[PDB]
């Protein structure tokens, strides 16, 4: 009652036993079902080598066993017959990669699914290459403006930083992702968006959105729908990383969105259970941490000699019922640098984007901030810490001392500041405008609701009538006393005309 012993192989060996001869030229299909196939022969095949079933079904030789090669099927086999002859290929999971990928939608084979046309490429990059080393990197330097006031102030993301987005169902993870991608039209980055196990309709929505926005000129949208095989859902983010590191190594800057990694881990546990590998927590294998660590650490800020290329990984994990200490959450939280934590109780309460400011962290920190941004962000963070302490005193705003009353007032207006509309990203200079108007104390007058309308009118009026501010900050990236005085003037002007309304 043993595998690999099919009573026909024993026949072939009884015929040809004389001495044990190399049989790598051939290979037969013993057992095939639910996406895997045990394969005889192939005694010189590598691990990870593409093995090509007759009828055209590519497979990958994952776990080489005693006398049988357990192979995951890169499609739905359902047609390969027992005893059919497999040939090895020799390649190890490569994708052609060129600049002409910019602007298209592909499946995890780097093969287009937008139906436009074939993507001409010359150079190939392996899918499972090793990461940049301990002496081939540079400490994170340059701010990646995400377009969100809250993130760009309190959780500063850098170029070459692996900032995790974590949340529950429908807290806005993909919302913040598209918000960032759409902010990065201006500066010169390549965006990558790798969808794992999502609806083709949702990929269609996001792709059409980038199309009507104009951000398709620099993006490559890898898509792997739910019906696709577990191996393709597993291989998607690595194709994204290979595409992205090709652009990285040519001195250019990249951003990649793994949305999500939970489905990649679920495809991995499916395959590992299917070809009989020992389970761990939630029947995950031991290698899920190895997987995520290799994939994440493939993305970092290269050194000066290698071109100062970089690749921000902005992965997403979805957390179930706030169990952020579960297996895959604690894995991704351990590997990544930062964590942008999204909360549905804030999401329902109106505070959108629903990030959790007390839980969110970024061990890159103010290093990756513009000087103007850090000058305003220090004061902003102190004010928000204060109102976070005083949160349990808002009902008692009738008999608190007027000082803590006014701290409640400032934090109350500052909550109105940080809310943003859907996929409307701001520039760093407009965000500096907003945080300055808030932190200095220019919104105590207007009531709790008007603040949003007041601030948008403020930004537009400044844009139209004091065009020195944005130029100053674009040139120096430093908040200087001249721009401070100019902003005070513009602020009071807009305040007067808005109040006369």
């Amino acid at each position: 009652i043993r595998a690999d012993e099919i009573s026909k192989i024993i026949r072939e060996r009884i015929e040809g036993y004389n001495r044990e001869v190399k049989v790598v030229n051939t290979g037969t299909v013993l057992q095939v079902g639910d996406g895997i196939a045990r394969i005889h022969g192939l005694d010189e095949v590598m691990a990870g080598e593409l093995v090509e079933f007759e009828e055209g079904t590519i497979g990958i030789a994952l776990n080489l066993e005693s006398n049988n090669v357990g192979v995951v099927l890169m499609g739905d086999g359902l047609m390969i017959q027992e005893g059919s002859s497999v040939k090895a290929t020799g390649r190890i999971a490569q994708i052609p990669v060129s600049e002409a990928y910019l602007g298209r939608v592909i499946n995890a084979l780097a093969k287009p699914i937008d139906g436009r046309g074939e993507i001409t490429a010359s150079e190939s990059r392996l899918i499972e290459s090793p990461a940049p080393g301990i002496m081939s990197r540079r400490s994170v330097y340059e701010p990646l403006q995400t377009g969100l006031i809250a993130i760009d102030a309190m959780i500063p993301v850098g170029r070459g930083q692996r900032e995790l987005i974590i949340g529950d169902r429908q807290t806005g993870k993909t919302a913040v992702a598209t918000d960032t991608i759409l902010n990065q039209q201006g500066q010169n980055v390549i965006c990558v968006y790798v969808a794992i196990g999502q609806k083709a309709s949702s990929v269609a929505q996001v792709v059409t959105n980038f199309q009507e926005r104009g951000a398709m000129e620099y993006t490559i949208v890898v898509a792997e729908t739910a019906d696709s095989p577990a191996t393709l859902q597993y291989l998607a983010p690595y194709t994204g990383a290979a595409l992205a590191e090709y652009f990285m190594y040519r001195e250019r800057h990249t951003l990649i969105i793994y949305d999500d990694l939970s489905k990649q881990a679920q495809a991995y546990r499916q395959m590992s259970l299917l070809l009989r590998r020992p389970p761990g927590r939630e029947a995950y294998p031991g290698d899920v941490f190895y997987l995520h660590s290799r994939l994440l650490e493939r993305a970092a800020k290269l050194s000066s000699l290698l071109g100062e290329g970089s690749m921000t990984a902005l992965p997403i994990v979805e957390t179930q019922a706030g169990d952020v200490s579960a297996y895959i959450p604690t894995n991704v939280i351990s590997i990544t640098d930062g964590q942008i934590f999204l909360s549905a109780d804030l999401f329902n309460a109106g505070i959108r984007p629903a990030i959790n400011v007390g839980i969110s962290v970024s061990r890159v920190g103010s290093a990756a901030q513009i000087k103007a941004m850090k000058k305003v962000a220090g004061k902003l963070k102190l004010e928000l810490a204060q109102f976070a302490e005083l949160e349990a005193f808002a009902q008692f705003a009738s008999d608190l001392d007027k000082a803590t009353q006014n701290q409640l007032a400032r934090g109350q207006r500052l909550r109105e500041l940080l809310k943003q509309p859907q996929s409307a990203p701001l520039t760093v200079e407009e965000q500096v405008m907003t945080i300055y108007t808030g932190t200095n104390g220019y919104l105590d007058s207007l009531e709790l609701d008007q603040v949003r309308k007041y601030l948008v009118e403020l930004r537009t009026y400044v844009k139209t009538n004091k065009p020195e501010f944005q130029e100053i900050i674009s040139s120096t990236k430093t908040f200087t006393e001249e721009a401070e005085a100019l902003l005070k003037e513009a602020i009071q002007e807009q305040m007067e005309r808005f109040l006369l309304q």
Binding site: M46, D287, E297, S325, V361, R363
Partner: protein
């Protein structure tokens, strides 16, 4: 030599087929002659974990397995992993295999030592429980270390955990004849680079004169397979253990951090397919933790003091990994974001931090009573934190006004100007022995220096420099 072929591979778990006579022992490292996509030989290493019989072992890989082929030649080295040790490794980054990754130059040292070893014998220990003196006021008075014991490190980011590490290295180098080592068990590569560069800039690693440095960094990254991330700690351990068994130097063994080594062992056992224990750790959690936590002692020859970071998952102090780690730990220093945000550096909380070494029959009744009175004053300050704000500081009684005054003086005197944070700040580094410490707190708390400004005790070395700064501040205030 002993040549065997690969039987089967399942990820980082390989099987090797040896002839009937020759067969390695448990934990014997195995070099596997293997190729690269460019054809280049790439030697992937293992370690025999189980002699599963039928002349075939089950070894766990220490590197990437993709590309390895059934029937490749594996050479039996015949002994546990032997890493390069000695003063050569100072200022040099290493792997779990002891093969350096800084691209400086090859370790020309001939001295190796097996990664696997028994703990020092029972007739070998140095029974004297001594307070390992550091020079930092807070950790000298309130969280006193013991030499050859283990010290947990509880600090969330931004509290200066790395600056504290570099200062500890600097003090053990300058005051004593010590040398430190850093073992990055599961170290994310960007922060590994950050730490290497911060040590290059902070003089802890003399980039111009290697082997005159004070640290031998062992980095086993998260990128590495689960087998490597576990044995990283043993690599760092044996490289430290040479420094005190032969050279009798007071070594510091930083392990950052213990929880990730524990879960890397959990992953190794998971791949090996042994039944799990409770909530998901490996069945040999206690014995695996022992194998690493009992080479850290003070023998007759030297002393390894282990200053290791600890992480509590799901906020459990009762999860098996924290519980087992605390069963070994001797003192914990806890760094808080409060003192970091305010500006009392280092950000150690003298109440959350505790030691079992602060017993009277260990540290002296005078040290004990001064530490107790300091803790009582700081605790009373935390209790009055809300009271004083409402009541007004004047409406307090005289005893509580004295308490808040001396508490502010004490909390400000806890600040210290660091030897390695002078590059950032501009304040020269300082070293404070326990004599200076106990007398400084005796003077501050005994009501004798109760006539000094708050700022005169802030970022100062000892009470003499405190008086000097106080006279400066008073002359600066007169005119």
């Amino acid at each position: 030599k002993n040549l065997g072929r690969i039987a089967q591979i399942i990820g980082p778990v390989l099987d090797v087929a040896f002839p009937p006579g020759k067969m390695p022992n448990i934990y014997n490292a195995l070099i596997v002659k293997g190729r690269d996509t460019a054809g280049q030989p790439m030697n992937v290493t293992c370690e025999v974990q189980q002699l599963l019989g039928n002349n075939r072992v089950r070894a766990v890989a220490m590197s990437a397995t993709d590309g390895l082929t059934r029937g490749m030649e594996v050479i039996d080295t015949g002994a546990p992993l032997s890493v390069p040790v000695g003063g050569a490794t100072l200022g040099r980054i290493f792997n779990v295999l002891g093969e350096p990754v800084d691209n400086l130059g090859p370790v020309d040292t001939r001295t190796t030592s097996p990664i696997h070893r028994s703990a020092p014998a029972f007739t070998q220990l140095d029974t004297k429980l001594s307070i390992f003196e550091t020079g930092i006021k807070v950790v000298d008075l309130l969280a006193p270390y013991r030499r050859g014991g283990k010290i947990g490190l509880f600090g969330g980011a931004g509290v200066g955990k790395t600056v504290l590490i570099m200062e500890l290295i600097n003090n053990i180098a300058k005051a004593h004849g010590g040398v430190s080592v850093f073992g990055g068990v599961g170290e994310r590569t960007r922060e590994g680079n950050d730490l290497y560069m911060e040590m290059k800039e902070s003089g802890v690693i003399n980039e111009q004169n290697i082997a005159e440095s004070k640290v031998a960094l062992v980095y086993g990254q998260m990128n590495e397979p689960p087998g490597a991330r576990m044995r990283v700690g043993l690599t760092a351990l044996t490289m430290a253990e040479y420094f005190r068994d032969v050279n009798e130097q007071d070594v510091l063994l930083f392990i950052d951090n213990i929880f990730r080594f524990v879960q890397a062992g959990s992953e190794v056992s998971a791949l090996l397919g042994r039944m799990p224990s409770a909530v998901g750790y490996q069945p040999t959690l206690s014995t695996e933790m022992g194998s690493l936590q009992e080479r850290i002692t003070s023998t007759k020859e030297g002393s390894i003091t282990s200053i290791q970071a600890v992480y509590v998952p799901a906020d459990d102090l009762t999860d098996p990994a924290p519980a087992t780690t605390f069963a070994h730990l001797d003192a914990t220093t806890v760094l808080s974001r409060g003192l970091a945000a305010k500006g009392i550096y280092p950000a150690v909380d003298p109440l959350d931090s505790t030691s079992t070494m602060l017993q009277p029959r260990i540290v002296g009744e005078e040290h004990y009573e001064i530490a107790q009175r300091v803790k009582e004053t700081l605790q009373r300050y935390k209790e009055l934190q809300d009271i004083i704000a409402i009541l007004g500081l004047d409406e307090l009684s005289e005893e509580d006004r004295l308490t808040v005054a001396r508490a502010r003086k004490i909390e400000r005197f806890l600040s210290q100007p660091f030897f390695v944070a002078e590059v950032f700040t501009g304040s020269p580094g300082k070293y404070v022995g326990l004599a200076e410490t106990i007398r400084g707190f005796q003077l501050i708390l005994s009501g004798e220096l109760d006539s000094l400004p708050e700022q005169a005790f802030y970022l100062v070395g000892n009470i003499d420099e405190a008086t000097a700064k106080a006279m400066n501040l008073e002359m600066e205030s007169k005119l």
